[model samples]
Target chain A: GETTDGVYRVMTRRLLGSTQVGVGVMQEGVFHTMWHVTKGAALRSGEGRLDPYWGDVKQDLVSYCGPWKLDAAWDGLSEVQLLAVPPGERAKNIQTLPGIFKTKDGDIGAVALDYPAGTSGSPILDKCGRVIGLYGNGVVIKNGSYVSAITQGKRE
Target chain B: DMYIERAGDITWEKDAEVTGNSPRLDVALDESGDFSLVE
Candidate 1:
């Protein structure tokens, strides 16, 4: 339960309303979470308190504070179980860490079940369960720095 | 430090990288010089 603030990350399965928050760590900042830069909605922390995650740019990133709002329960947080990549399969380049979260209605584990959190709008949380950043990267470097992104529509 | 720029419209540029099994994070440019991120 005791984790460094930069050990994990965060994510959302459904960003448009239906939420599924997951966890990971800050990998490489100043990057995009989605493979498609224009696919997801860029997060705007309602409280305006999370200016450090995205560059200054922007996670289940729930727009609502209904889920994963501080201390809900362990059941609300997803856990990262040890994975055993098969001999024939290439290991997945995990972009997320491990942890669970909640929703507007109830609690649930990560939707992927066997994967970590990632994708744009996903938040990289620490072991202590704080958002280090949104998707784009994972794991903390000894002396690494980061840059955030803007993951919304590009209608300009 | 991160190299920041836009392509064609809103796409980003300057070339980026990641670790194993991951694709290269590169810059994508369009007709009007706007930029954004792409594989």
Candidate 2:
């Protein structure tokens, strides 16, 4: 008998002009979870600040961890939505949305919109109610950070 | 047991001297799933 179900994991990190953001996902057994770096204390310690073009000067990783109830149906294929909210507002109830783009090359090639100056929280969620991704201003690969374009193709 | 394969691979090479010439070639795959091109 097998103890754990096959789960897929994906991670993305970006080193923008001055700020660095990272996103991660993990699904094990019946539990599925996701997390993001809202602030980078270490980067801040090393002289990291938010870029004007990028917005904000906060250095921290805002992470969200929860179990996904729709794993069996989704399998390894699903669409992820990165929702952004303005300051002083709840992320779970914001309507205005931003564009989520995926890169053509590199590992974990995707990023989400960043919350503006006065945003409460930005949450990444899946169509099936499973949190499988996160929202970040830009994405960073092995060489450096660059803007990514959205791609459409068959998954499998 | 019933099983279905969902994908296949295609391969080809171009000839430098032939700019618009179309050559008929035969390619085949064996039981081992390996193939070779014959000119």
Tell me what fraction of the real C-alpha contacts between chains A and B each candidate also makes.
Answer: 0.00, 0.00
TM-score for each predicted model, relative to the true structure: 0.20, 0.27
Candidate 2: tens digits of C-alpha lDDT, residues A1-156: 121232212112343232212222222322221112333122111122211111122212221122232322212333444443332332232221223322222223233223443221233444444443333333333343332211111111
Highest lDDT model number: 1
lDDT of 1 by residue, B1-39 (tens): 111111111111122122222112233434332333333
Once fitted onto the true fold, the runs of candidate 2 whose alpha carbons sit more than 4 angstroms away are A1-79, A92-105, A109-121, A139-156, B1-39
DockQ of 2: 0.01
TM-score of 1: 0.20
Candidate 2, residue A57: the lDDT equals 29
Write model 1 residue lDDT over A1-156, tens digit each, in one string: 212222222323345543323222222222233333223234332222222222112221222111122221223333322221122232222332233222232322231212223233443333343333333322222233222221221211
Say which candidate scores most in DockQ.
1
For candidate 2 chain B, which ten residues in a row score worst on lDDT?
B1-10
> In DockQ, how does model 1 score against the reference complex?
0.03
